[PDB]
Every structure is written in C-alpha cells, then in structure tokens.
Ligand binder design. Sequence first.
Ligand SMILES: Nc1ncnc2c1ncn2[C@@H]1O[C@H](CO)[C@@H](O)[C@H]1O
Ligand SMILES: Nc1ncnc2c1ncn2[C@@H]1O[C@H](CO)[C@@H](O)[C@H]1O
Ligand SMILES: [Zn+2]
Ligand SMILES: [Zn+2]
Lengths: 157, 157
Amino acid sequence: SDHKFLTQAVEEAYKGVDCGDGGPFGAVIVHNNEVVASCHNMVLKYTDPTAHAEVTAIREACKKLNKIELSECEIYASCEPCPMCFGAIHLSRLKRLVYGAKAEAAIAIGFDDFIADALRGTGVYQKSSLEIKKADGNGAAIAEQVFQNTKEKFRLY
Amino acid sequence: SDHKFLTQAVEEAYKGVDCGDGGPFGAVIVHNNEVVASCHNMVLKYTDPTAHAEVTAIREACKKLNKIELSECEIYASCEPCPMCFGAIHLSRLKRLVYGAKAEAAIAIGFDDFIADALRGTGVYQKSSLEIKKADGNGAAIAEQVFQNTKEKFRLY
Ligand SMILES: Nc1ncnc2c1ncn2[C@@H]1O[C@H](CO)[C@@H](O)[C@H]1O
Ligand SMILES: Nc1ncnc2c1ncn2[C@@H]1O[C@H](CO)[C@@H](O)[C@H]1O
Ligand SMILES: [Zn+2]
Ligand SMILES: [Zn+2]
C-alpha cells in the first residue's frame, strides 16, 4: 500500500506545479488506508512560505478529522521533509512517515540546502522517534525524477 | 525597541491563553518599527498543530505585505522557537530573531522537549544565517514569568 500513496503524492507534486500553486512537492495523509488529505505545495497560491505540501496536508487532515493529533494517520511525502515540515510532522503526532526522494534531488535543481537534522539523526537537542521509511526501487526512482522533469515549469522560491 | 516588541509578544501569549486560542506563546513581526504582525498560538482555535505563534505571525505578515519573503523584517518570539518554527523563520528569510525565554522554561511547565539545534548552533544539516538575540534582564524575566503565571489556565497540547 506504500507504493499507491507515494504514487499519489508524486502525482500531487506534478499537479501542483502544473497549476502554478507552488513547487513540485506533494503529500498524502492516510488513516488506515483511507485518504484523509491529498495536497501539494501552495506557497505561491497562498502567498505563504510555510505552505509546503506536508504542512498543507497536516492542516487539512486536522481540520477534516476535527482533532490536532494524527496519531493513527500516516504521511507520504514526495520529498524528504525539510526542518519545518519534519517539525510539523512531529507536532502532529503522525505515527509513520514514508518519503520518496532524498533532499539532494530537490537541491540539485537549485532549491535551498535545507535538511532536517532530526530526520537524518544528526541533532544534539532534537531527536525523533517516529517510524521513517525512505522508499526504494520503483517509487523512489519516479519520486527522484520529478525534479528534473519539472525544472522549467516553475520559478524557484 | 527590542523590549517593547518582546513585551508585545508576551502580551499576545497572555491574551491567547485568556481567550482559549492556544498555549502561552506570542510573536510579533515588525518592519523597522512598524508592527506588521501580532499573533499568539492558535492551535486550539484553528485545530491546527502548526498554528504556533511564530508560524501564525509569519503567515499574517506575508499576507499583509503580499509577498513570501520578509527579509526586511524582524521577529520577536515570547519563547525560543521550536524546530518547526525556526525552520519557518528560515524559509521566510526574516533577518533577525529576538526571543524571550529559553525552551527549558516551557518544558518546566509541561510542554515537550522540542528544541531547535540550528537555533542553538548545534545543527549539522541545518545552518541558519539570521541574527539571533536571547533577551536578558527584564525581557527574560517577563518571558519566563509567562509560564508560571499561566501554568494551569490552558489545555496542554
Ligand atoms: N512543499 C515542499 N516540500 C518539501 N520541500 C520543499 C517544499 N517547498 C520547497 N522545498 C524545498 O526543497 C528543498 C529540499 O527539501 C528545501 O530547500 C526546501 O525548502
Ligand atoms: N506557539 C508556540 N510557540 C512556541 N512554542 C510552543 C508553542 N506551542 C507549543 N510550544 C511548545 O513549547 C515548547 C518549548 O519551545 C516546545 O515543546 C513547543 O512545541
Ligand atoms: Zn518543508
Ligand atoms: Zn513552534
């Protein structure tokens, strides 16, 4: 079931960049194989630098489920979450994170060098414990290729 | 001018607790010496765990200025910004952060141990550029007192 929802997140990334909402990033929040939220980056559409795909998905999932904790939910991100988005995932109490592409694939097309220490386990003060899965194989290749595929379709931010 | 805006952020923390919007946290974003945003934690009001005071102030300031970058603005936080909030401050490109109380003051009254390595200078993958000032003396006393004064007047989250 991981492949299906990572796929959906990647397609959200493509859709968001095509409609000009924001960058090529998508996020799907799922509750026991029920899609609670399906979102992409909305920084340009919302004039909001915090409206990454993961944060937008968290906001919509929490509003839909009428609670601020998503402890029985899981989040699929097309890209390895940034420090802000990983902090948001922590605060949301999401129990599992699956992500598609390494941050380096997004950095390679000119995005900021902005990587979450707590995700990679390189912090002194911030330590994470939530289950984290980096996809491999098919979905990982597709998720990594998103950035080369969308390079000329949007302005960097 | 720092003490005035830090005190306004602390005041926002008190207001947000009093009307039940969220926890005892405030944030004020100013452009030179004009307040562009004045906010407190809105997690309970919005059913949004990302609605910390700093994130809320960033979103409202970006709406007021009609742009996604705040490089000419500074932010005053009643409490040391969390990993999510410090990451949002990085993305928003605010040029200066002044914060009131160390995170340990909020941990002492029941909030999670959730500290930003990049703020304290122990980050490996996240390196910040912005000027950071920890208040001392009266501003620190006020910001720290926030937590003793409100310690059981709000619902923890
Ligand atoms: N919705 C988004 N989701 C993930 N990363 C994003 C997003 N928007 C911009 N980025 C940037 O992509 C890079 C790789 O994570 C970082 O510089 C980060 O700020
Ligand atoms: N609006 C807020 N602003 C800053 N810290 C907050 C806020 N709400 C909750 N906290 C928590 O306070 C603690 C100290 O930073 C952390 O656990 C953090 O998540
Ligand atoms: Zn992010
Ligand atoms: Zn925060």
